[PDB]
Each structure stands twice: as C-alpha cells, then as structure tokens.
Amino acid sequence: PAAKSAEDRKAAAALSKVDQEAVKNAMSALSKVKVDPADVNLLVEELELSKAKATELLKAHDGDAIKAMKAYIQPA
Amino acid sequence: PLSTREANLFRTVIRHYEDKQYKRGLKAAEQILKKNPKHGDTMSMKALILNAQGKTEEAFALAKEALTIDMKSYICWHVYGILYRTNKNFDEAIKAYKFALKLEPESHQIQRDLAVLQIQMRDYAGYVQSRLNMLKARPQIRQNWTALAIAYHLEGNLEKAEHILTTYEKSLTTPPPKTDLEHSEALLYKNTIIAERGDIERALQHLETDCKHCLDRLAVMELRASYLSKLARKDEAAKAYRALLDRNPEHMDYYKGLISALDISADDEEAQKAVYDEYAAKYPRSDAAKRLPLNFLSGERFRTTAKAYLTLMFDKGVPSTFANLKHLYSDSFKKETLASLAEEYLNEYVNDGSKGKGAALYYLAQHYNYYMSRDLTRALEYVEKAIELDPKNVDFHMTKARIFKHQGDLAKAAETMDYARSLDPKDRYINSKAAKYQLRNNENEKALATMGLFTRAETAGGPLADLTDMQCIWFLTEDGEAWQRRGNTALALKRYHTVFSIFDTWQEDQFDFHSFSLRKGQIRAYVDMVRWEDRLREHPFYFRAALDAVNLYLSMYDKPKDDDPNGEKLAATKDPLGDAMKFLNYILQFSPKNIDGQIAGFEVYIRKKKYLLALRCLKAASAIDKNHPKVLEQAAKLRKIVSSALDSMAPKLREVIQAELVGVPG
Amino acid sequence: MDIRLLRPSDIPLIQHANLENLPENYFLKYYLYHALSWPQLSFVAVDVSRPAKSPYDYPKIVGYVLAKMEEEPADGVPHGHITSLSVMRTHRRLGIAEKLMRQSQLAMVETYNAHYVSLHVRVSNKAAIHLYRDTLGFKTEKVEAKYYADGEDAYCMKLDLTALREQIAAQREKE
C-alpha cells in the first residue's frame, strides 16, 4: 500500500485504490431424470472430481456412468 | 440486544473505522463488549480492525468465532468475506460475501464487491446478473452499460452484448466530439464484437460509417485492411495495407497482406521483389524491406540479393545479422551460399571496433556453431580470428563460450562467458548469461554472486531475495534445476514452488483491474487480459518448472515470516504424489498438447492407484504421437496391471478400462 | 526485426527482457497498469525468425518501449513519459530504440494530444543520451539529485512534439 520509492509505484496502488423513459423501458426489455447416488460417488473417486462436477457430468449423459466416463477421457 | 447507549457506541465504531482511527474504535467497541460480550456485530468489527493492523491470524479466528455466535448476522459474514478477499481465498470469500448479501440485499457497496469476485472466478452467469442489477440502480452512467455488455460478451452472448452497447448509444441526444476517448473506445469494442459474430460485412460498414475518425488510428487502419482482404476487395485492401506500411515498415505481416491483395503467386519470385524494393527505396531504414525477400528468392537471385544485404550489415557492423538469417538454413542451398558469400566478402574487403572484416568473420563463426551447418572446429578458428582483430568485443567471446558449451566442456564455457562479462561490467545481459553458464556448470554459489552485481544492494536476504521479489523466473528455474542435479532436493523444490507462487500472483494481479478498466474505459485491453489470464499457465515459463517438480517428486517416490527457507520440509514429505497434483493439474489443463506432460501425468496416476486417469493421460499421449517409445511401454504396463488387479476393483471400472484400452496400441 | 503494439500476453517475456538488460525492475502488475491504461503507447520488438520449441511458445521479446501519460498534467497540459526502454545486446545497432520511440510518440499525439514527451536518465549513460539528444532531439530540462535509493543524479529530458503535431494536423485535415 503506497510504498514510498518511485512515487508512481505508490501511485499504481493509488490508481488501483436525464431522459429516463427510454432507459427504463430498455431495462425492462433487458429482463431431470432421477439419478443414482452411488454413481456420483464412483466418479468422484476415480476422476477426482468434486461431487458437484461428478453429478453434473452424470446429468449430462442421463445418469449413464459408463457413458459419462467414456466421454470424459476423450481428448480434444 | 444492545439497546441504545450501546446503539450510539456501535455507530461511533463505524465512524472511526471510516476515519481510519483504529485505536479509538477498538476502545469504543470494547465498551460494548463489556456490556454485550456475545454481540457478534461488535466482535467482528473488532476482528476487522486487527486485520487492518496485520493480525490476520487472530483476526480470522475472531471473525470465525463471531460468525458462529450469530450465523444470521450479515456483518459477521461480510467481515468474514472481507478478510478472505484480503487473504486471496476467493472461493470462501465469494461464498461468504454471498451470505451477507443474502441477509441484506440492495446494499450497493456489497453488490459491487460481489461482482468483482464473480468475474474473478469467471462466474459469468453471476456476473451478468450482477451487472444488470447494478445497471438498473444507476443507468445514467455509461460505465454500467459497458460493464453489462462486457458480462454478456464474456458469457458468449454476443448478440445481447451488442444490444446493450447499441441501446446506450441510441439514448445520446448529441454526438460526442471526436476528442472524447471513452466513446471512441466504446465504438471499437462494439466493432470487434460485430466481427466476432463473424459479420465481417457489417463490421466494415460500421467501421467506415461510425468509427472513421476514432482516435486509435492503428486499430482503425488494421481492421480496415483485415476486413477488406477477407471480403476479397483486393485493390482497396492493397491500398489499406499501404497506409499501414507507411506507419511501420518493420512488421512482417503488413507486406504479406499487401502481396496477397495484388494476386502475386509465391512462385513468381521477381514480381515479389519488386514490391519489397519499392519500400526499400522509400524507407532506407527498414530492415524488414531488405531482409524478407531472402525468404522466397532462390538460385542466383538469392545470391545476388544476399550479398547486397550482407554488405550493408557487415559494413554497418550489425551483430544480429546471422541470427536474423539462420531460419533460412533449413534449405541447404541458401545455407551454403551465405557462408560462401561471407568468405567472398572477406577477401574482397578494402579498408574502429568490429566493424567490417571482423563482423563478416563473426557471421562465419556463428555459421559453423549453428546446429544445421555445425563444424565446431572451423567456428573456433573464425571466432579466434575475430577476437584476434577485436579483443574487447563482448559478443565475440560470448559466442566462443557458446562453442565450448557445444563441445560439452561446460567449465571452459562458463569461464569464457564470465570473462566476456568482465569487458562490459555495466551491461546486465552478459552478466545474466555468465550467471546462467555458471549454473549450467553447477556452480550455484558463484552464479548468485554474479547476479549480485545488479540486484538492489541493501535488500535483506541478499540477491536471491531481490530476484524473488522482482519475479525473476529464469534464474529461479535454472537454479532449481542446478540444485536438483546436485542432489539438493530441498532447494530445488523450493525454487519450483516459488515459480508456482509467482504464477498465483500473476493470476491474482488482475483483481484490481476488473474495476480499474471500467474507469479508463479501455475495454478491449481488459478483455485481452482476462482471456490471456484464461490461458495463463500455458506459458512455457510455468511448464518448465512444473514438470521439473513433478519429475523430482516421481524420483522421490521411488527412492524414499518464512516457514521453510531451505525447502527442507518439501524433501521430507510423506505424500510426494499428493504434493505434485497442484503442479500437474495446471500442466494437463492448460498444456494438453505436450506429450511430456501426459507421460508424466500417467506415471503420477498409476502410482496413485488411479488407473482411470492414467488411461486418459495414455489416450492423450497416444493421440499426439502414436509411436512414441514411452507411451508404448506405459500402455503395455497398464494392461499388465489391469489384468492382475481387476478382480478387486469395481466392474464398471474394469469395463470402461477394457473398452477404451483396446483402442490404444502398445 | 519485427515491431508491433504491446500485447498483454507479452508481459511475462517483456518483464523477462527487462530483468535481463536493466537494473530497474518492476512487478508484473506494473506492466498491466500500463497495458490497461494506455494500450496504444507501448510497442515491442520481436524476434520472429526464432524457431518454435513447443506448441505454446510465446513471442520472444528482444526490445520494448513502455510508455505512459501523466494523469496529473503539469499545467493542464498532457504529456507522455517513457517508463522504460531497452534493447537486447544481441540486437543493438539495427535502429530499434529509435523505431519504438517513433511509434510511441506518434500514438501519444494522435490518441492523447501529447504536447511533449519526457524521460529520466541516470547520469553515467552515454549511448542512450546520444539516442535521446542526437537522434531523437531531446533537450535537457533539469537535474534530479538522488533520483532514488541509488545516489546517481538524474537528467530529466524533454522532446517538444509541436513539429510532429503540425505535420500530423496538416495531413489529417487534408485527407
């Protein structure tokens, strides 16, 4: 935080430290198949993924663990 | 809770904090804690002030303690988050920030801070939502529109990002003056977005109509040339590259651009040279305009031109001439011709430094040192003759040292390079080289002392400390590899980890800029940085040290205030394979095309008994180089392991293994 | 060699070039701050004929100019400053420092209306002083005693860009 030398290196820290109607309208304008718990536990251990990513991966392939694992190890 | 005398005391705790009066505020908060000792809000704020005075450790525990007392207090979680955000644990911070906002939404300061962490962890959906809310609260400021456009853009929603930008523009009653830099930058950002959707027709249209007079002149001129060429409007694109050519005669691609627009076939050698000569005549100081024609010229046409080029450079004494032409040595004819021409010039020479005859000899010296035409004995002779003519030339002796290196005599190479340093002690480049050569000869303590001639003097902890501070990755890596070669596992690991830590810093460096770039309005640069950051550790600077670490841990596995200054804890690890993962994960995720990474990943995972990840590594390595010697051995090694231990492991693993294993030839 | 506008991905190798050739070094974060505030002002010399050792090799940086404008003008008068300028020893005497400066000066005027450009120099340099004075036309403005931790005095040198401005304004209006 604002170290003395160079003055600027201190400054680098320092720099780093009504027609509404169209707008309002513009802004208002601006705005599952049950899964097996064990499959999720198998993938977490063997792919070393978080429970979230393991579940998500299974969900991407309709709970087919063998399909999901085969897909994941395919290279670009 | 606390009711009213205490109520005003809490308020003077907030006031003293916003006035940076820490002491009056602790004593003030303490008056509340004597009345309400389990008042979380007061306690966290006390936890807060300690952190603002480098008691991070106690501070965190106090905040953790405060949050347990009142888990439904929005101050405790915010504080908990603020501590986290200071301490770079962005993941618990994002989570903790999330609960404070969950207790008290609408708070503009908290939402601002939430959006930053969110873009920092590339939660695009979060960032989009965040900016939209923010835009809703303060829609008179252009920044909030651009910010939401940025959010949409990074999410992949280009159409909506363009919409947000265009919507703002339609609200402007008066056209801003061409001196307005914010507007200029906003237009080009929209323009690049039009192009990224692949609508080159429209982006060019928008360029000529709305961007014609933007202040970033190079950007406008290059986009124009790029777009015209892709649209095959060749005459006009030719003309566009000429405007650009006049600005910077030294940029290879502009000539390329021009020549394509003229419809000149690479076979027509003479027609291409005409183009280059026109600008060589027009811009006598362009090196490019003289040098580039040697790429496609051949036979006598090459010789004649190469002589004329060599004569310019040698007479001027330019030392980078060889280095500037050696790419051509893949073609044997051009290789031999250049050596013959140098020799021809030497004899033909008529009459201080290394200007002239010495300079030609140096080309030949380097010629026979280069691996495509290597003859180390003749090279030595030429360099000895150059040094004969000019004994104080740094670049000559430096090349000599490099020749010794190639003979394999590292000691002589370091001694000569170090001598080379002694001729220009004011010049750091040769100093770094000397240090480097000394490290290559495993002379560590000497090399650090060499570097010491240029590190800030009264740095505490000597040279090594300054170089670490100044993020000097080259030295750290080389020193580690040197220490490793000597069996010094402790310091080797310490160095590689330091390079790992330097990259964590670089990744965190972008934190203040998510906000900062909105003030400058310089948005394209901002998206460039995020995207560069998105591929940060693909840089060889990471890769080298990281593969070393992993390799050193692999070795360690088969042969069983600074908290660790000699890296002694590292060598004594009980889980080497575990300590390797943080290096490996980045290698595999950002550098997948490197077989070396995959082979090393495979070795780490089989040892880890994780046979599924091993195969993924194997399949990767095999896809890059089918017949690589290592992958065939490891492939054969896995199937032995699989056929043996398949009864103990679950059936789905056996099945997926066996299925995707036959693919792979071992 | 090959001259082009600074790119954020160049920053690690720019920094490395700086570490090799110059005693004044900075955190990576400090290059970012230049790159994101004034992306139009910094240029690099690139060794393009370098063979690639790997599928992910970045451009090998053999020269650079890092420039910025002072956000707080002397008299409400915008002016550029050269934060750092260097060329690898292996690539000297090709005109590079001169080229980098001319690319930068031109962008400072065009994008930011720079009235002049300035720089500081430790007192014992020569090669650079001939570059700034004899080649670029910088005049010396004053002496900074003990510019920093290191005791050497510094020269503040300045180049009037008035001449470039009329040449530019005459040609921008005429087109």
Author numbering:
A (entry chain C): 26 to 42, 57 to 70, 81 to 125
B (entry chain A): 4 to 354, 365 to 573, 638 to 743
C (entry chain B): 1 to 175
Please share text taken word for word from the publication where this structure appeared.
The NatA complex is responsible for the majority of N-terminal acetylation of proteins with a serine, alanine, threonine, cysteine or valine at their N terminus after the cleavage of the N-terminal methionine by the methionine-amino peptidase120. Here we present the structural analysis of HypK in complex with NatA from the thermophilic fungus Chaetomium thermophilum. Our study shows that HypK acts a negative regulator of the NAT activity of NatA and sets the ground for a molecular understanding of HypK role in co-translational processes.
While one of them locates in close proximity to the Naa10 substrate-binding site, the other one occupies a groove formed by Naa15 helices α8–10. Helix α1 was positioned in the remaining density close to the active site, while the connecting loops (residues 43–56 and 71–80) are disordered. HypK helix α1 comprises five hydrophobic residues (Ala36 to Leu40), which bind to a hydrophobic surface and might limit access to the Naa10 active site.
